[PDB]
Design a protein around this ligand. Structure first.
Ligand SMILES: CC(C)CCC[C@@H](C)[C@H]1CC[C@H]2[C@@H]3CC=C4C[C@@H](OC(=O)CCC(=O)O)CC[C@]4(C)[C@H]3CC[C@]12C
Ligand SMILES: CC(C)CCC[C@@H](C)[C@H]1CC[C@H]2[C@@H]3CC=C4C[C@@H](OC(=O)CCC(=O)O)CC[C@]4(C)[C@H]3CC[C@]12C
Ligand SMILES: CC(C)CCC[C@@H](C)[C@H]1CC[C@H]2[C@@H]3CC=C4C[C@@H](OC(=O)CCC(=O)O)CC[C@]4(C)[C@H]3CC[C@]12C
Ligand SMILES: CC(C)CCC[C@@H](C)[C@H]1CC[C@H]2[C@@H]3CC=C4C[C@@H](OC(=O)CCC(=O)O)CC[C@]4(C)[C@H]3CC[C@]12C
Ligand SMILES: CC(C)CCC[C@@H](C)[C@H]1CC[C@H]2[C@@H]3CC=C4C[C@@H](OC(=O)CCC(=O)O)CC[C@]4(C)[C@H]3CC[C@]12C
Ligand SMILES: CC(C)CCC[C@@H](C)[C@H]1CC[C@H]2[C@@H]3CC=C4C[C@@H](OC(=O)CCC(=O)O)CC[C@]4(C)[C@H]3CC[C@]12C
Ligand SMILES: CC(C)CCC[C@@H](C)[C@H]1CC[C@H]2[C@@H]3CC=C4C[C@@H](OC(=O)CCC(=O)O)CC[C@]4(C)[C@H]3CC[C@]12C
Ligand SMILES: CC(C)CCC[C@@H](C)[C@H]1CC[C@H]2[C@@H]3CC=C4C[C@@H](OC(=O)CCC(=O)O)CC[C@]4(C)[C@H]3CC[C@]12C
Ligand SMILES: Nc1ncnc2c1ncn2[C@@H]1O[C@H](COP(=O)(O)OP(=O)(O)OP(=O)(O)O)[C@@H](O)[C@H]1O
Ligand SMILES: Nc1ncnc2c1ncn2[C@@H]1O[C@H](COP(=O)(O)OP(=O)(O)OP(=O)(O)O)[C@@H](O)[C@H]1O
Ligand SMILES: [Mg+2]
Ligand SMILES: [Mg+2]
Length: 1175
């Protein structure tokens, strides 16, 4: 459970990690080797020259002799530096590349395995758990695992080796002066382990909070139309901000932990080698050792602070990866009982289609304490049609869901041909069944691709036959792009009847032996339903079919009618057989350019955090300049140490040095904590602010923006989770250490200018060489990051669509198809990662090699400077010591380039989305707010074309009127434009030509929120939230807090209060995602209650009683009649029972008013209205 990641490594990855780790140990010992020949050899030679100095004795010959002696040695050391840098180029490329390649391969495998496990889970698991969290994790937690298993591990092995290599060199050059450091090393490791565990624990909770926020974002962006209709933008933003705040607090805790860890590490190493300083100096003045502090061993153990400071962030990244892997691998390791990928089961060759339910007891996992089916008995003979009738919530859809083995009954057996379906192969069982859900769901692709989900190997002739049987051929052939025309998410860019007929065809292409029809004709008009029913009855003999129809005309022709009452079959028989019993059936039939200043503009939104940046930059300057100043202070200490007079009096300086290194350690602790913490807190504030502003801007947009193919729910959620994380990757501790290293380089340059002005030219020469490689690398990485961000949204779209439509995906047995699509969508990012591995490796290797080439050049040039009597040897050594730290700082800065490109791209996109302004702005306080509404709605010659299919005319000209106390009934064929009128009255879109009036005022001159607050709308396919029944009902009026009594009154008006009260947890019963844990009629009634809680002046009913039963719709209609006068109501209905009482009926055909008048007038006249009610 600790190396749970690295689970999917294989032979090649294990070799990349060993060879990369071998290179990292070889890379790490180059710097100690640089100190070895600089310290042990040259400093000793210089001291011997000063110690064995005879003043002006044979000066003319001796000066030249010693100058040549040191110059030859320095040239040889320059050659050694060149040789070390030559191998540094290879070892550094391997260290970085090999660890990046292994990380990329492992992350690819982890993503594929995670998506496979999510698709392999069960329907009950999906009901119990939340799924927007899964969608957010698949991106964010996988990226977090990636940032901790890659080249940062190689960077840890490299600094660990520098620390140890320095220790080993010190041990070789002196005894017992490094055992003190080696004894405190375990304390440092223990501290590292403790704070790594703390940070991993914090990361787990922070990712939980981010997943909770992403779930809210996903639900809101999937129900954006309901959110906009009910003015819920402000409450949905508040819900998102609630989780953003928890994530921000956890991130601040993470920053405190990590930065106090870094500060404690620096304090501990400083105190540890300060004790060594004191003890060793006491023993050296005791003459136990001669040279232990003279620039050899104290300069070998000086790089330990740099090593620890460089190793700590990689430990933090590893801890974050461990925290991220928890939930991912928990989901991966979860195994389902009803496994749809197992090959363990029977696959009968010839199935005659006999279905039997024997004593079925079932209760849902989400509500165990509610019994749905209690001893259900049902037999379906071969090639027979059986109709399930009864009141809503009776378990009719539960029977269909059990027939597909989405759940297992708690008692009893479901069997096919006398064989238990539990022993049949699950994939085979689901493949021999075609099912149409109560409210069908499509996918964001073309019509032909949607139909191919039923059967992949289907041909175009078979598709045409299926859409002829589904009565969709004419509607598809009247479209541009015909079968290749692209539908929206869930089929949103099609009308209800068209979307349902597409699903009917998708079921038909499977050639199913068992056909499950669940309210398959709810959204179909009577004319289309007739031909669909004829087509179904033309091929009934080949298969056995179960139909759940509220339309009772289709029930009459069924072979056997089953009746549901109290979770059992009360009356089973034919039409006349049940007419004999005159029971339930009788009662029922009785009536771009990525600008370079994007990252600076995103940092101006942190202007309120300027005091945090000031102190952080000051602390970064202090601790960055401390590193080069160490050489100067050590050189000054050497002066008071080489000859202090009496050996015993040296104890004063001995205790002075311990105080110096202890105060220095305290200062390092304080400054490192400040530098990390202030920048981290500013970054945590910035991340939350950016996420908040992006979500608010997304909620501000128009419906046409969400209708775009590139703005799907998955793409939007991926954008939300990704743009903030990429910007965060270049802020905080990274941006702090960037300033730290810049101040380090500046301090080195300044002391070089003060002491030797010649080597400053070498520094100003090495800077551009690293700079050019950095800029070309950043150019390549940004160029590829644009496409990486473009392609990641597609994979997010695939994952979100599969997870949100998991029930349909499982019914169609299309898990493997979506896995293939996800894998294919991962291809371009994977290859870009593989190429970035080599690019980053080669750039890092070039930078590191240039560092050692600069060291060699500095040595060679200092040789000439000393030869020409320009610079003293001690000054040359001091400036070279500065140059080493400066070059390391420059390389560390260059290592920040990969993050900055992604940050710039994401910052540009964030700026663009934030600054975007819609046309129909709902956040605008401008517009008229009439003080008196009379409920007069007039459409005056409205011409409208949808933005996604602008070539198609929807409404050629539309003129209808309605006043207070009147009901306007919209009738017509599917796709006529009835639901477009509702969306135009809701100001979802503006008409191309024409006008819509409210009490004589143009609705474009009104306030958008004010106008929407006067409308009560229930959509054709109502959508709820994964919240309580009470929250869903109270969502109708988001301006005020709705009382419990008012919620109960609305529920009673909607004829749902009895069900809610007879249910455990009552009104606090959490509804499923989109209302899936309710019956269809129950969800429709909850939406009716949500609409009625407003007491709206205009009531918009769009097939508001499609999922209801006869008694329920009668009660709802009586309530509407009781609240009829005093409000304007527009009704879209197919049933004659909801049109008879309408004041005026308008027949809209082809987006025009064809027939108008009262029911009596339209029935007396002969035409479309008379034809539609023939039977
Ligand atoms: C040997 C010198 C020259 C270099 C020092 C190398 C160490 C910095 C690293 C590099 C490889 C590492 C090893 C890589 C993998 C493993 C296996 C690991 O055990 C398992 O993988 C199996 C147990 C489990 O499933 O968790 C225990 C740590 C260990 C020995 C690691 C210990 C630390 C090692 C030796
Ligand atoms: C300081 C040390 C690391 C230097 C030692 C010499 C290296 C340059 C050699 C020694 C072993 C070699 C590796 C041995 C085997 C392989 C497998 C070889 O073939 C594959 O399995 C690749 C398959 C694929 O790419 O799909 C790829 C290169 C690699 C890692 C080699 C790359 C070059 C390595 C690291
Ligand atoms: C001084 C001598 C010893 C040469 C030192 C460097 C080599 C060891 C380098 C140079 C070319 C490198 C190879 C160039 C390209 C590849 C392919 C690369 O695989 C991919 O690009 C991944 C593609 C995928 O996974 O689909 C794996 C490493 C490998 C073998 C590299 C291994 C390391 C190599 C041999
Ligand atoms: C480059 C050389 C000079 C040293 C660099 C690395 C070291 C600082 C060592 C000392 C402690 C080591 C660790 C000691 C214990 C573990 C836990 C170990 O976990 C397991 O595999 C547990 C199961 C098992 O014991 O097999 C994995 C390796 C790791 C992190 C080791 C990795 C290498 C570390 C960090
Ligand atoms: C010589 C100094 C300067 C550096 C040495 C650092 C290592 C000794 C530390 C750094 C990070 C540590 C790792 C951080 C993460 C973990 C998980 C942690 O596991 C737990 O105890 C919690 C697991 C659980 O939740 O059950 C301890 C082992 C391990 C591999 C740690 C092993 C020791 C490591 C490698
Ligand atoms: C402070 C941070 C930056 C350093 C931490 C380093 C170690 C904790 C890691 C780095 C690479 C890891 C190794 C990478 C790959 C594997 C294979 C992997 O194997 C399995 O767990 C197989 C399980 C299965 O096949 O089901 C785990 C052990 C091991 C040796 C890992 C042991 C722990 C290691 C040495
Ligand atoms: C920043 C680095 C990585 C790129 C630029 C490299 C220069 C800083 C180095 C590389 C070659 C060096 C030269 C190589 C050899 C010599 C000859 C050397 O004199 C001799 O060996 C004999 C006397 C003579 O003939 O001049 C004086 C220094 C000089 C000019 C060196 C000066 C510094 C140079 C230009
Ligand atoms: C081509 C790319 C990688 C950038 C160029 C950087 C290095 C290749 C340069 C910068 C520093 C140069 C070195 C600076 C100084 C010297 C000393 C000088 O050689 C001598 O010492 C000659 C006398 C003798 O043989 O002892 C000229 C070569 C050399 C190694 C230079 C070789 C080329 C180096 C490594
Ligand atoms: N996933 C679920 N988790 C918990 N309870 C559920 C779930 N799905 C349905 N229910 C409950 O199952 C019961 C049976 O309703 P079911 O979905 O079987 O509808 P039905 O009887 O076919 O009626 P309708 O005509 O409305 O479709 C209801 O009480 C409903 O709220
Ligand atoms: N968002 C959209 N983008 C593009 N075209 C759309 C969109 N929504 C609907 N359409 C199309 O506009 C036409 C009008 O459909 P509309 O939703 O108004 O039908 P309706 O009269 O309410 O009928 P139904 O009872 O089938 O829902 C149809 O051809 C439909 O496919
Ligand atoms: Mg149903
Ligand atoms: Mg409609």
């Amino acid at each position: 459970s600790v190396l749970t990641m690295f689970r999917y490594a294989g032979w090649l990855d294990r070799l990349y990690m060993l060879v990369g780790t071998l290179a990292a140990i070889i890379h790490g010992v180059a710097l100690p080797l640089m100190m070895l020949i600089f310290g042990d050899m040259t400093d000793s030679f210089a001291s011997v020259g000063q110690v064995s100095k005879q003043s002006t004795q044979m000066s003319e010959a001796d000066k030249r002799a010693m100058f040549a002696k040191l110059e030859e040695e320095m040239t040889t050391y320059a050659y050694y530096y060149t040789g070390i840098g030559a191998g540094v180029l290879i070892v550094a490329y391997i260290q970085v590349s090999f660890w990046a390649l292994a990380a990329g391969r492992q992350i690819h495998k982890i993503r594929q395995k995670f998506f496979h496990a999510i698709m392999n889970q069960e329907i009950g698991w999906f009901d119990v758990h939340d799924v927007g969290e899964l969608n957010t994790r698949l991106t964010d937690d996988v990226s977090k695992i990636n940032e901790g298993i890659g080249d940062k591990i190689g960077m840890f092995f490299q600094a660990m080796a520098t620390f140890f290599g320095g220790f080993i060199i010190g041990f070789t050059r002196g005894w017992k002066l490094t055992l003190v450091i080696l004894a405190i090393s375990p304390v440092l490791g223990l501290s590292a382990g403790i704070w790594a565990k703390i940070l991993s624990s914090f990361t787990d909770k922070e990712l939980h909070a981010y997943a909770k926020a992403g779930a809210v974002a996903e639900e809101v962006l999937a129900a954006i139309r309901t959110v906009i209709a009910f003015g819920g933008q402000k409450k949905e933003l508040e819900r998102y901000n609630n989780n953003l705040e928890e994530a921000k607090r956890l991130g601040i805790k993470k920053a405190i932990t990590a930065n106090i860890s870094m500060g404690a590490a620096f304090l501990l190493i400083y105190a540890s080698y300060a004790l060594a300083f004191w003890y060793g100096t006491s023993l050296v003045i005791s003459k136990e050792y001669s040279i232990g502090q003279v620039l050899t061993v104290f300069f070998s153990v000086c790089i330990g602070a740099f090593s620890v400071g460089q190793a700590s962030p990689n430990i933090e990244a590893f801890a974050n990866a461990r925290g991220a892997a928890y939930e991912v691998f928990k989901i991966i390791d979860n195994k389902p009982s009803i496994d749809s990928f197992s090959k363990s089961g029977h696959k009968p060759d010839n199935i005659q289609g006999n279905l039997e339910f024997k004593n079925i007891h079932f209760s849902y996992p989400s509500r165990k304490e509610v019994q749905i089916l209690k001893g259900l008995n049902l037999k379906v003979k071969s090639g027979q049609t059986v109709a399930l009738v009864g009141n809503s919530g009776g378990g009719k859809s539960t029977t269909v869901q059990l027939m597909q083995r989405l759940y297992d009954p708690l008692d009893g057996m479901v069997s096919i041909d006398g064989q238990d379906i539990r022993t049949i192969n699950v994939r085979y069982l689901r493949e021999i069944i075609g099912v149409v859900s109560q409210e069908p769901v499509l996918f964001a692709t073309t019509i032909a691709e949607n139909i191919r989900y039923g059967r992949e190997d289907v041909t175009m002739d078979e598709i045409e036959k299926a859409v002829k049987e589904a009565n969709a051929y004419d509607f598809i052939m009247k479209l541009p792009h015909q079968f290749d025309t692209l539908v929206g998410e869930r089929g949103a860019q099609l009308s209800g009847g068209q979307k349902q007929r597409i699903a009917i065809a998708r079921a038909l292409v499977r050639n199913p032996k068992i056909l499950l029809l669940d309210e398959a004709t709810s959204a179909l008009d009577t004319e289309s339903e007739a031909v669909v029913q004829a087509a179904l009855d033309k091929a009934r003999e080949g298969r056995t079919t179960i139909v759940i129809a509220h339309r009772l005309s289709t029930v009459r022709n069924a072979d056997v009618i089953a009746g549901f009452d109290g979770g059992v079959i009360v009356e089973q028989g034919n039409h006349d057989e049940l007419m004999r019993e005159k029971g339930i059936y009788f009662k029922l039939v009785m009536t771009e350019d990525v600008p370079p200043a994007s990252f600076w503009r995103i940092l101006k939104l942190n202007s309120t955090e300027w005091p945090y940046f000031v102190v952080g930059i000051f602390a970064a300057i202090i601790n960055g300049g401390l590193q080069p100043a160490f050489s100067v202070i050590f050189s000054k200490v050497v002066g008071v140490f080489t000859n202090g007079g009496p050996p015993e009096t040296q104890r004063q300086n001995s205790n002075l040095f311990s105080l110096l290194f202890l105060i220095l350690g305290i200062i390092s602790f304080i400054t490192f904590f400040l530098q990390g913490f202030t920048f981290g807190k500013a970054g945590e504030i910035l991340t939350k602010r950016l996420r908040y502003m992006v979500f608010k801007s997304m909620l501000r947009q128009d419906v046409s923006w969400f209708d775009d193919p590139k703005n799907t729910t998955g793409a939007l959620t991926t954008r939300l989770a990704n743009d903030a994380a990429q910007v965060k990757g270049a802020t905080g501790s990274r941006l702090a250490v960037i300033f730290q290293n810049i101040a380090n380089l500046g301090t080195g340059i300044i002391i070089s200018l003060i002491y030797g002005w010649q080597l400053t030219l070498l520094l100003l020469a090495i800077v551009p060489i690293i700079a050019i490689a950095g800029v070309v690398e950043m150019k390549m990485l940004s160029g590829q990051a644009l496409k990486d961000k473009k392609e990641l949204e597609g994979s997010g779209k695939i994952a979100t669509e599969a997870i949100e439509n998991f029930r349909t995906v499982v019914s169609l047995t299309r898990e493997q198809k979506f896995e293939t699509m996800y894998a294919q969508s991962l291809q371009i990012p994977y290859r870009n990662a593989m190429k970035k591995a080599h690019v980053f490796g080669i750039t890092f290797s070039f930078t590191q090699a240039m560092m050692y080439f600069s060291y060699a050049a500095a040595f060679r040039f200092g040789a000439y400077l000393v030869t020409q009597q320009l610079m003293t040897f001690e000054n040359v050594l001091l400036v070279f010591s500065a140059i080493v730290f400066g070059a390391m700082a420059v390389g560390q800065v260059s290592s920040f380039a990969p993050d900055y490109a992604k940050a710039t791209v994401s910052a540009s996109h964030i700026i663009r989305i934030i600054e975007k302004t819609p046309e129909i702005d709902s956040y605008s306080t401008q517009g008229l707010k009439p003080n008196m509404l009379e409920g007069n709605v007039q459409f005056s010659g409205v011409v409208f074309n949808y933005p996604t299919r602008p070539s198609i005319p929807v409404l050629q000209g539309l003129s209808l009127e309605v006043k207070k106390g009147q009901t306007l009934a919209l009738v017509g064929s599917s796709g006529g434009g009835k639901s477009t009128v509702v969306q135009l009255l809701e100001r979802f879109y503006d008409p191309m030509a024409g006008s819509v009036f409210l009490d004589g005022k143009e609705i474009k001159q009104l306030n958008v929120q004010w106008l929407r607050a006067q409308l009560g709308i229930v959509s054709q396919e109502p959508i709820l939230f994964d919240r309580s029944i009470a929250e869903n009902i109270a969502y109708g009026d988001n301006s005020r807090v709705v009382s419990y009594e008012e919620i109960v009154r609305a529920a009673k008006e909607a004829n749902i209060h009895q069900f809610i009260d007879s249910l455990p947890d009552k009104y606090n019963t959490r509804v499923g995602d989109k209302g899936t844990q309710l019956s269809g009629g129950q969800k429709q009634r909850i939406a009716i209650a949500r609409a009625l809680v407003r007491q709206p002046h205009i009531l918009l009913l769009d097939e508001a009683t499609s999922a209801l039963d006869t008694e329920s719709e009668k009660v709802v209609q009586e309530a509407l009649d009781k609240a009829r006068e005093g409000r304007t109501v527009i009704v879209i209905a197919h049933r004659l029972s909801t049109i008879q009482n309408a004041d005026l009926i308008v027949v809209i055909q082809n987006g025009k008013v064809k027939e108008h008048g009262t029911h009596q007038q339209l029935l007396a006249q002969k035409g479309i209205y008379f034809s539609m009610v023939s039977v």
